[PDB]
Design a protein around this motif. Sequence first.
Motif, mmCIF file in Angstrom:
data_model
loop_
_atom_site.group_PDB
_atom_site.id
_atom_site.type_symbol
_atom_site.label_atom_id
_atom_site.label_comp_id
_atom_site.label_asym_id
_atom_site.label_seq_id
_atom_site.Cartn_x
_atom_site.Cartn_y
_atom_site.Cartn_z
ATOM 1 N N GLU A 112 31.779 121.342 27.529
ATOM 2 C CA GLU A 112 30.883 120.766 26.528
ATOM 3 C C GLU A 112 29.447 121.257 26.734
ATOM 4 O O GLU A 112 28.751 121.583 25.771
ATOM 5 C CB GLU A 112 30.935 119.230 26.593
ATOM 6 C CG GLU A 112 29.949 118.497 25.670
ATOM 7 C CD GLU A 112 30.184 118.736 24.182
ATOM 8 O OE1 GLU A 112 31.205 119.356 23.806
ATOM 9 O OE2 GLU A 112 29.336 118.287 23.377
ATOM 10 N N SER A 115 29.259 124.874 25.777
ATOM 11 C CA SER A 115 29.346 124.958 24.327
ATOM 12 C C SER A 115 27.993 124.650 23.683
ATOM 13 O O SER A 115 27.540 125.379 22.806
ATOM 14 C CB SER A 115 30.410 123.984 23.810
ATOM 15 O OG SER A 115 30.561 124.094 22.407
ATOM 16 N N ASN A 116 27.340 123.580 24.131
ATOM 17 C CA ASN A 116 26.046 123.224 23.560
ATOM 18 C C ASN A 116 24.978 124.270 23.853
ATOM 19 O O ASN A 116 24.099 124.517 23.026
ATOM 20 C CB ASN A 116 25.606 121.842 24.054
ATOM 21 C CG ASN A 116 26.450 120.723 23.462
ATOM 22 O OD1 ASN A 116 26.878 120.810 22.315
ATOM 23 N ND2 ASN A 116 26.681 119.665 24.238
ATOM 24 N N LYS A 119 25.680 127.127 21.484
ATOM 25 C CA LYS A 119 25.343 126.734 20.120
ATOM 26 C C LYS A 119 23.870 126.990 19.814
ATOM 27 O O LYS A 119 23.529 127.506 18.747
ATOM 28 C CB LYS A 119 25.641 125.249 19.895
ATOM 29 C CG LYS A 119 27.110 124.892 19.759
ATOM 30 C CD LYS A 119 27.274 123.379 19.709
ATOM 31 C CE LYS A 119 28.731 122.972 19.611
ATOM 32 N NZ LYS A 119 28.888 121.491 19.638
ATOM 33 N N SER A 125 30.410 128.396 20.030
ATOM 34 C CA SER A 125 30.824 127.114 20.570
ATOM 35 C C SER A 125 32.177 127.294 21.233
ATOM 36 O O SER A 125 32.834 128.327 21.073
ATOM 37 C CB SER A 125 30.915 126.059 19.463
ATOM 38 O OG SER A 125 31.815 126.452 18.446
ATOM 39 N N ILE A 126 32.582 126.285 21.986
ATOM 40 C CA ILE A 126 33.847 126.336 22.687
ATOM 41 C C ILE A 126 34.810 125.285 22.173
ATOM 42 O O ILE A 126 34.407 124.211 21.724
ATOM 43 C CB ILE A 126 33.646 126.102 24.200
ATOM 44 C CG1 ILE A 126 32.793 127.223 24.791
ATOM 45 C CG2 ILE A 126 34.998 126.027 24.906
ATOM 46 C CD1 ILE A 126 32.462 127.023 26.251
ATOM 47 N N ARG A 127 36.089 125.627 22.227
ATOM 48 C CA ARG A 127 37.152 124.723 21.846
ATOM 49 C C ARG A 127 38.151 124.784 22.997
ATOM 50 O O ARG A 127 38.585 125.866 23.386
ATOM 51 C CB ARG A 127 37.810 125.187 20.545
ATOM 52 C CG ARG A 127 39.042 124.403 20.210
ATOM 53 C CD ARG A 127 39.365 124.440 18.734
ATOM 54 N NE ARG A 127 40.369 123.429 18.446
ATOM 55 C CZ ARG A 127 40.442 122.742 17.315
ATOM 56 N NH1 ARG A 127 39.563 122.958 16.343
ATOM 57 N NH2 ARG A 127 41.381 121.817 17.171
ATOM 58 N N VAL A 146 33.739 130.624 17.453
ATOM 59 C CA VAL A 146 34.416 129.660 18.307
ATOM 60 C C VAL A 146 35.271 130.428 19.306
ATOM 61 O O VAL A 146 36.065 131.294 18.924
ATOM 62 C CB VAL A 146 35.330 128.722 17.498
ATOM 63 C CG1 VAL A 146 36.194 127.895 18.441
ATOM 64 C CG2 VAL A 146 34.487 127.799 16.636
#
Length: 290
Positions: A112, A115-116, A119, A125-127, A146
């Motif tokens: 998370e 990812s932020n 961004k 971003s990451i999933r 992504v």
Amino acid sequence: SVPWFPKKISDLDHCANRVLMYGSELDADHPGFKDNVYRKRRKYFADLAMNYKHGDPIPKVEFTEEEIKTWGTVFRELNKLYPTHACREYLKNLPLLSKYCGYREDNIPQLEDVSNFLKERTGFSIRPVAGYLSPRDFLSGLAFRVFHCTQYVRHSSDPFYTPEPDTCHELLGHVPLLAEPSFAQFSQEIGLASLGASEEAVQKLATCYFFTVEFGLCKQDGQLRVFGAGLLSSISELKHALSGHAKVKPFDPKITCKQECLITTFQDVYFVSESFEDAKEKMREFTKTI
Ligand SMILES: C[C@H](O)[C@H](O)C1=Nc2c(nc(N)[nH]c2=O)NC1
Ligand SMILES: [Fe+3]
């Protein structure tokens, strides 16, 4: 007809769980096959990914001492090689991610947080993903900036085990460069070109991605260096590629796409990209022909 493809970032919910390889299922040859605790842990990470939906903050995990130590060894060993083996763009970005996301020998960065960070830097971003997807599905994620990323850690019995990729590969091999604008643009364009594309087209795009993002090399100041994620996360292939043992050729889509992508062994040839901007330009010319 045109195969189904995502039209908006939330559509990735319809393919992120289409795992074809790895995941919670461990084969008899897996280092942690006979580890009951490891098996349950892998089911846990797999469930977090399967239950994830676009928009959710990525579940943060309190990693165990064993997982942190395994990451530390991998991180420690690879970091000894980066200064002299990695391309300057990687060296410029790893420190950045490390400071703002907590990359330390005794701390595994949270997806998370990474990812932020991405961004705000490049819109990437990451999933979280349970395992490996088909080339088409994985590439479709890039179209929306992504990056599907594994969250589990390799078994502690062998910190140098690469047969099955893990979160260390993602965090050390793929993440840093996603913070680089030109690299992010290059990656997204491969994804965009793959959306609804033919099987042959996706195969060619996947191969170009393989020999750039995964195993690409650069030549800086006349010295061969690596930028490919698979090289940046593998001690053995990292050294092999920069030794005069491996064949090296200029990146050229029309030719590079003809090369077979090897697993289990070192590549028969590695390709050198002039720059991310140039690789991007070459792919633009290429995709116009497929
Ligand atoms: C990108 C290329 O198609 C490669 O074969 C794939 N890589 C990945 C994948 N799936 C995941 N989760 N991660 C990858 O790196 N599916 C296919
Ligand atoms: Fe990878």
